[PDB]
Design a protein around this ligand. Sequence first.
Ligand SMILES: [Fe+2]
Ligand SMILES: [Fe+2]
Length: 131
Amino acid sequence: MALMTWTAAEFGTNVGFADDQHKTIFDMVNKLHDTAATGNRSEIGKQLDALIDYVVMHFKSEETEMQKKGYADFAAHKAEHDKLVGVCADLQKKFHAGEAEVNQDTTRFVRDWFVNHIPKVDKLYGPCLSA
Ligand SMILES: [Fe+2]
Ligand SMILES: [Fe+2]
């Protein structure tokens, strides 16, 4: 099974670009999850780095739109993004030093993060960003 399945009932924000970027994230996490069941460390690292770069770009996209529109919860929302980015960058520094491995607990963690963040945090910007 794919780790992550996107539906509108679970995750739709009413903001087209954000929904699309979320779908990409889910697909990139699913590839990482599959590779993380192997010992193909170079393929894990390529997919890890591609996912994290995309996630940072998604967060920048949401942040630019929230801040330009004076969205009410912008700074607290960005704080949640920045703590995930710090976790991911720390994981990359360790993984790329040989000091940690990426496995399916890594991808279930990131799944947990997104499945909580999108409904509880991202959906709240829908009225403002869709107006
Ligand atoms: Fe998001
Ligand atoms: Fe977000």
